[PDB]
Symmetry: D3
């Protein structure tokens, strides 16, 4: 298994973000997915967005302190104002064993809505929008 | 809306660029509160395995009181499904006393042992489970 | 667990001290935040936190404990409110399970204020929050 | 003015992340600084671990603003066999905010610590060649 | 100017990481650089590392809340235990004007040392081969 | 010798790295904050960090260490301020008790700026913080 999507975010899992068991807190993972997913939505929307839904999330494997943590995004659908993005969280072992090992720890499907200054719905610009163009192209492949 | 899981104040450190509370913080509160109820029903450790139907309805503002409420929807051998609702109360901003649901979701937890292997939720001596099943029976 | 529930959360690793227990500062912060919510409720708006008295650190909090702050109002003045805050722990995923006890307490004083930070009178009319407060006072 | 009394315990800058809804620094942050500073002097006097057991008094006098320099000063008031009572004052200095140069006391508190062993049980503060204790008692004497 | 090195880290600049000027705190920027550079160092070292030196750091342009922040790294020299990495910090504007704008905001040169889990030499390891190749190129 | 005390705090577990020591990013953060305070005092206002040279990590910091930053201004320009920052620890609750040593140092450059982030001239008039710093530089 390999990642699908573009790289949204990349970071190191730190001790401050652990839970009682010593693994990384699920809340931190959700936040990383949220932040990452939103970057890609803002890119496509050419501006501000809000998250309106997360229809699914699956916590597959735990994350450990010291793991490199990447979030990949695949835009599934673009509406007049909405953007639906699948996010996968992947880890790479760089200083724990087995080194170089990579695997998918978490997934989710987020929905964002393009908004104005007042948080109110706005139409995603369709003209001269390369970021949208790229997404629509990958969607049209299935 | 079920039982009170968590309660706290919305703080400036947890804001987003728009200046509302960051959605990541909200999801983290829902997870923590839901897990507390799951652990109560399970009579010990749980892991979070899934979320479905998370809806962000309204923004949270700095200074809002934030409560998370939980209603257990199903209990399996090891799995617990809990609807978590996030509610805000205006105590020191207008309009004073106003309360409303801002976010909801359904979390699934699995009862686990010390090795992180699933364990059976005890049917014996478990009034937490008895309460959750009676509430489910009322729906 | 005496008085009304102000706050409830889980104790986390990031809030530990060098001994591995929960840092005293975090517990003080939870108390002040919970105490202030009830003061704001009672005051029907803004307050300021002006004093603390008789804070007692009884037992340590452990990572993974459920942490609850309870509030017992002791006095309501024109603008001042004194609240006893008790911090309680519940063991839900550590032994012994279902065990609860009081780990910290303190008395906070708040003052109801207007938008320009001047003191204001806590309304006695249509104030169910105060009514419930004065019932708490009914223990000395 | 009034001038600070005691020895410098802590010095830091008040930061945006530690603000309340009014935009001032949160009271819990100030309490935390006072406890940490107080505890350092207690440990210095006690020659090792202590635990905090009481705060008999705390007064929030004035607010702290983002970008204030914040200092905690400590005065040991009393030393028992294992206990140490310490008055903490919090002072601010304006360096990049108006009016520049102004200093004043914003917060005080009186803390009680107890010297403990590795197991968290009471221990006797060593008196023989304890130069930090000697220094504290000499100040208490006058 | 275009980015040099491989992508180390990518994040969003958040309000909690602001300074008293209202820009993003230099402390946070340095922390990103250290984290990102160490990742590449550990990749080449095939394990744990410590930071021993930062010989240079230059803060070129401020970072703003809501900016996308990327750290890129280029290994300059690999020794027996030592790894030297130039880090560049770049920002991309995605929901502030000018939208689409990218530019370099910070750079630094970090030195790392390969250590075991107490307190070693680098295996000769296709990370090292990619790094040494680029070095031989420049 | 050390210079003046910029900052003093306790190393906390929230600031640890994956090795269990204090994270180097936190140390760099303390140094930048403490050095900026001195720079701000001399500059009679706001500053920004523009450069670091010769940063050396000497020993690790441990949870529960007392951490102090000390500063010595080396040079003042029209708007720039060069400050050597040393980070020291003191053991107060871990062995060996009372031990103190330098764990990090660096040379920081700050630039005096206005409210729009543009460099400004450090005033020579009525500035005794500058006078103080140039006094020590005079000594070499």
């Amino acid at each position: 298994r390999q990642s699908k999507g573009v790289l949204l975010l990349r970071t190191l899992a730190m001790p401050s973000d652990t839970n009682a068991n010593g693994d990384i807190f699920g809340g931190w993972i959700m936040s990383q997915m949220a932040m990452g997913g939103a970057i890609l939505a803002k890119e496509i929307a050419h501006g501000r967005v809000v998250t309106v839904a997360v229809e699914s999330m699956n916590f597959i494997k735990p994350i450990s302190v010291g793991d490199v943590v990447c979030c990949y995004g695949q835009c599934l659908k673009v509406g007049r104002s909405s953007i639906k993005i699948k996010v996968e969280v992947w880890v790479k072992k760089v200083a724990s064993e087995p080194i170089g090992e990579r695997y998918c720890v978490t997934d989710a499907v987020f929905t964002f809505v393009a908004v104005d200054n007042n948080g109110r719905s706005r139409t995603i610009p369709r003209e001269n929008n390369q970021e949208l163009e790229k997404a629509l192209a990958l969607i049209s492949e299935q």
